[PDB]
Amino acid sequence: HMYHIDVFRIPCHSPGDTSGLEDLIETGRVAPADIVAVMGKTEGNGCVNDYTREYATAMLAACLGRHLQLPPHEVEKRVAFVMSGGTEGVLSPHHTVFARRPAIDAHRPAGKRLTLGIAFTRDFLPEEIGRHAQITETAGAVKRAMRDAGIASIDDLHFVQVKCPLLTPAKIASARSRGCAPVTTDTYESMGYSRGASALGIALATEEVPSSMLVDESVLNDWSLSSSLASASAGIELEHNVVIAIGMSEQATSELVIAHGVMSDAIDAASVRRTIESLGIRSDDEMDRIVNVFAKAEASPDGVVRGMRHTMLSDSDINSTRHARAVTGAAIASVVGHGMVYVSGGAEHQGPAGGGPFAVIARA
Amino acid sequence: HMYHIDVFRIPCHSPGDTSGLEDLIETGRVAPADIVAVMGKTEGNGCVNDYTREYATAMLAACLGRHLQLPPHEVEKRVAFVMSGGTEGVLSPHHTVFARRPAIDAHRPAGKRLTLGIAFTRDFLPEEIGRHAQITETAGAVKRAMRDAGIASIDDLHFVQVKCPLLTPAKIASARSRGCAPVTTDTYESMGYSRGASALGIALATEEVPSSMLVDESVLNDWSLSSSLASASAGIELEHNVVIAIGMSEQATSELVIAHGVMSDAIDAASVRRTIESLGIRSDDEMDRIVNVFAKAEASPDGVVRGMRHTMLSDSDINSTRHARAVTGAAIASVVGHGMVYVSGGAEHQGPAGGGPFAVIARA
Amino acid sequence: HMYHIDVFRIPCHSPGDTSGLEDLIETGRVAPADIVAVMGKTEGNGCVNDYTREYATAMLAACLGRHLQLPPHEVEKRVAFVMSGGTEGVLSPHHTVFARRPAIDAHRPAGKRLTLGIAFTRDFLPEEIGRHAQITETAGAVKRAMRDAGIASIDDLHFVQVKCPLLTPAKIASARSRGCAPVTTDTYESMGYSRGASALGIALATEEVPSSMLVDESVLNDWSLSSSLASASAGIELEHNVVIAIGMSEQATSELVIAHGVMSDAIDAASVRRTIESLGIRSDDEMDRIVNVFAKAEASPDGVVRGMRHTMLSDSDINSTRHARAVTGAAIASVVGHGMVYVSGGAEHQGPAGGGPFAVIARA
Amino acid sequence: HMYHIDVFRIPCHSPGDTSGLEDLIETGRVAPADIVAVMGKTEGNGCVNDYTREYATAMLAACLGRHLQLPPHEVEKRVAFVMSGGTEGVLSPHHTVFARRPAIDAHRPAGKRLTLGIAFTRDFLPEEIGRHAQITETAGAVKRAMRDAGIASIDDLHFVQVKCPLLTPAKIASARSRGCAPVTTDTYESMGYSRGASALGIALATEEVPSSMLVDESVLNDWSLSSSLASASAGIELEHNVVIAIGMSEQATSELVIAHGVMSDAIDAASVRRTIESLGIRSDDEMDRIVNVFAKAEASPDGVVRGMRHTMLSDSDINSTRHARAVTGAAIASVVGHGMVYVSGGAEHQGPAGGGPFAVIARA
């Protein structure tokens, strides 16, 4: 497990736009066969009926399928596509492409460098979403992803992205027909439960939360249970979980590094600055050493931000996750200088309640 | 309990518009002191952050407060204000004003005529919404409203409107601080639970559902439990339930009658025409004998309407109740010739699953 | 121009779902090479940022591309894809597939039968949208489509569907950089202008409106100018217009017929019944002779429907076209028995102001 | 013109909440008769159908009407109510109350201190909104407000808030019935035209734009024309313009000062910190010397923010002004430590295109 990882942030003019990726291939900057994961921000609403996620995946897969002479469906088994919809405010649609080659000879750089591993779980039954099975399956996949990445210990783990399912009326009917109640009957709320259970799965695998406390009825209730590494994103485009583990390894030769932190709340730009700094970035002129930032954001569930009431959880026109992404996208943009960053909404059991984990990838 | 009931449908140009009501008062058509209930449709979103309901109530109360030389808050104890927001599609904002005077002696004439009674419950704690207390309190208020109306039996009862509360983040935090879990943590979903528990309260009082089956865990789960008379509407503007019972009494001398039915689903215009026709109305020029129509509508929770999938429960931009009101408002409008009708959304335990009760008020 | 036309309404479980089409191919019911047009209803918002339209097109093209061993891009030149987003209320996502073979020998049936022709215009510059160039180019394409269909005269023309572009900030900037002002700077409003100009293009070609009156500044102003045959739908997925002309020809041997009418307003179910009847459909049991219904709907621009105010044009949360589709989708559903029908919103210069043209396709 | 100005930021739990104001009155902190203006942020959508603005005004007026024994309508002539809806993201609903008393003699102390003057224009006809009449009337009212404030020169003027009307379908129909075309037929867009014309009115009065260039055809077209002091907010609750001029006067004895700047774009937190720092505030514990911040925000009309595409102008679910307020509310919150600040959206001819003016009020 001695890799060389490459990471490319590429703009999208629309969800189906693969032109930035065609360009990387057509100019020899990346080899199609080495691509192992894509994390995207697509300009749908990021909630239930957002098919921009599936559309982006489908086109990327078709694009890679051509070059590899594979069926799209086969590419989707080989490459972890995680498309997070919702690019509110200044958030600029884009893909972060991850490529992996065997370690660039030896050549062991002075320290640990960026590594990455991927894993998948089985498809979940509707009645399993938001519940124990989703937690335990996720924990398992995290561990395999860690192994696949060549991450020696928890200490070298810096970011765990999970894509997870959500409930539809048909799925709810299917659960009911087996005499099982789904965790909720509201499709929007199902996303939070799916994210939450998945996040707790990560917390289990990282030993951040003792197994004993992970009972179903603690999902979305116990705000104290969380992983400071978990980034979960739900979607209608899949029935299983997709896991990407990102970290640091002595066996990696990547010209890249990753660090992580936590935002104490939606507007905690300070933490972001602090963690960026902890990677030797010391102006606005050095910012271009950052490849991208990946962050979780949420509407504070107590209904307050720094003592003041917010309306993000009372707004029936605009869902809380949409507000939250707009806010945190702005906070981060003010730091790095623009809104082409990965911000995902709904940070249930991810970092502190009202806040969320984030990571930064930069040139070594 | 010998009354003369008058009913007036009055247009609103905006939620605060009381001009249609000032006109009725000025022209001697209604006496301020006789008004006992107003059922309104206001052009807010009909969900959680719809303050058009409270605004309409506040202005109507202030308008009546002037004439009666009362404080608005006192008027709100004397008059049942039930404001249902959400006037999507062709739905036209309006108030239906109900006035009650001592029964006329110079006429009746013969048989049962429109009567109406009102009742209130106590304020509920956040943790009681959607649960047994809300059910039992509602059942009680239904009975009192019946008595106040002078409704001899269940058979003479044609419509039970209930206004009920909903959960906000502050209320949720309050319940949590007492160690009690609210029925849900999603404010939108809370509306359904509040409507549902209230509907089951009506079903209890009407003996339409045996007391034994009304357990908390059945609320929003058991679609077979329902009242074919219940119309529930949730709102952020109150902590208690307001109940208006409408029916027919031999003691009433109103020049008006009420009939009721159920829509088997959101587009079941047929039932509406069938119930209208059961009042000897059968051509679009007799239609002006109808004072108003009052109807419940909902997105079919199996996710299908007559075998075809719908997207009302998967749409995170537009909530299912908004779709449902648009649809049923249209269906009814196509029958009566316009959209100035009372359609409320979310018909949990109200009529059949996917359908909802409705009633028609017409000249004798 | 002696054709046999086949028409298939196929359900979609999601925008990318081509399974209903794979099934028709895999069971010999349709030959991929004969398909000339697909008119779809996809479950995006039907406004500017609805990429469900492009996604559906992309997958259909990829699906057909496999069987024909063509690139998707090439299929999109051969087949007219018109995807109309927005499936509000009871509207059920689906595709209507059109296939064309040379006339099934001779075999001239007793009367005229369904025929269909397609045409395309060039790409428009941003500054041309909503304006004369779009009108005249559309008029031209209508005529070619008529010819391609083998439609002898205007009298045999029953439906003209046009897909047209819309404006984005980038397109607006591009127009500005050439010193030209775009017709509007609001992307949502641009859709109406694009639909409107296109509709007037149809009216020009059909001689329903004299050429003299079609000045730019009459677009969206003069409600009296209209085609009673035009159905226009705007989209972000194309820079040109796509035109499908549908009608009747003595040279066609299709086991299908088409008739058209106009809804005087959004809830004018009567007209639909009337036009259905004019094709010998005489119960609810004969309804299954209808293959599909295609209808335009809009928020009445005077702000009133049958004397009552509506809020469809004052609602900043939900755009007027979304309300309108919900309403008319419901009206039509109440007639044909379900919501799997083609309803498109924004009927500017299409039928009467507040109303819209529709057509019905049925078995001979 | 010798005043003592007091400014109070008071939280609101809902649009109708006047409890924070009752508390100031009860505790002798402010005298009802001295209140001359209230600038509020209410939790409606901030667009066309936001009646939270009117509801807040109505209740504040009724609250003050009680204490002054006046009719609400009379209070509204005496006090400038400017309610800006839309509290997206971390924006916390609140009122800023302005009170004005005869200048204190027992102090001043030295130099210029906060002063404030108000003015009103006549009601505009629908066809005048967005056009020359609105520009010239606004310019006039700015001058009078200046005089009323006792502002010696343009240099001492720091902030000009204007509340302005918008178009409804009824108003549009009215303009049409007089043969006059409204500036737009889209109600949402009308808000921009009203804000823009009003902003140019301010620019005229401040000599920031030469009268010669202010032609109707330049409104929303010429982004180079702007006032760096103008803050305009449109609303359905009024037909005239309300102008509040805020600045510094030697005749004022207020313990408060005002400074202003411009945000170059929506995420330009830097400028805000820079202007804050120009008042000797440089650590998050000195921050409580700020009474409030007042800022304009807008979606950059070129469709890009710092070279990256944004989706704020292409999102048909969420209007650009809602995004913009969320973004800038967040940016500012990250600086002052919370979201209880006045941020208004739509900054047409206000500061730079894509940016907007802001001001800060602080203890001397």
Ligand SMILES: Nc1nc(N)nc(N)n1
């Ligand atoms: N698509 C998506 N899903 C979630 N759960 N969160 C975000 N930000 N995007």
Ligand SMILES: Nc1nc(N)nc(N)n1
């Ligand atoms: N205001 C309101 N509340 C509910 N629950 N339903 C409707 N239609 N309106």
Ligand SMILES: Nc1nc(N)nc(N)n1
């Ligand atoms: N996509 C789409 N575009 C328009 N203009 N109308 C409808 N109904 N759908």
Ligand SMILES: Nc1nc(N)nc(N)n1
């Ligand atoms: N109510 C309101 N109106 C405008 N134009 N802008 C904002 N922010 N609020």
Ligand SMILES: [Mg+2]
């Ligand atoms: Mg969290």
Ligand SMILES: [Mg+2]
């Ligand atoms: Mg029901």
Ligand SMILES: [Mg+2]
């Ligand atoms: Mg029309």
Ligand SMILES: [Mg+2]
């Ligand atoms: Mg500006």
